[PDB]
Amino acid sequence: MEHVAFGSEDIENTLAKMDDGQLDGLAFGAIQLDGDGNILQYNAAEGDITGRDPKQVIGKNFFKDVAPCTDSPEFYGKFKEGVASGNLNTMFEYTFDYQMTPTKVKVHMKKALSGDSYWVFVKRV
């Protein structure tokens, strides 16, 4: 297991070092998005929570294609304000319910140390 706690203040520095294999060792779901919401990385723990196959959703658009339930002011709205602003750090509870058993989660979105990319971290509550 890769040893990083959900919600850690320096999580974006820790995860900067990790390739897709290391990301699969985390204790929580992790998705890396570009500024348009396209999926760049998607780890094994996220697939365990949601049922999606990580390999298959890379390159899809999270808001339009994969996760329409997050296309709302309460999730996508927060994301797009963060991308526009160039800063994002927000944690909230949400329910994921698209083509799956409704599953309550805690979501943390944070701008990556990269460039123009953004993390979404997910764990069960």
UniProtKB/Swiss-Prot annotation:
Organism domain of life: Bacteria
Entry-linked SUPFAM superfamilies: PYP-like sensor domain (PAS domain)
GO molecular function annotation: identical protein binding; photoreceptor activity
Keywords from the UniProt entry: Chromophore, Photoreceptor protein, Receptor, Sensory transduction
Swiss-Prot/TrEMBL GO biological process terms: phototransduction; regulation of DNA-templated transcription
Alphabetical list of Pfam families matching this protein: PAS (PF00989)
Disulfide bond sites: none
Modification S-(4-hydroxycinnamyl)cysteine occurs at: 69
InterPro entries: PAS (IPR000014), PAS-like_dom_sf (IPR035965), PAS_fold (IPR013767), PYP (IPR012130)
Mod. after translation: The 4-hydroxycinnamic acid (p-coumaric acid) chromophore is covalently bound via a thioester linkage.
Segments forming domain PAS: 23-86
Function: Photoactive blue light protein. Probably functions as a photoreceptor for a negative phototaxis response.
Family to which this protein belongs: Belongs to the photoactive yellow protein family.
Subunit structure of this chain's protein: Monomer.
UniProt protein name: Photoactive yellow protein
Classification lineage: Bacteria, Pseudomonadati, Pseudomonadota, Gammaproteobacteria, Chromatiales
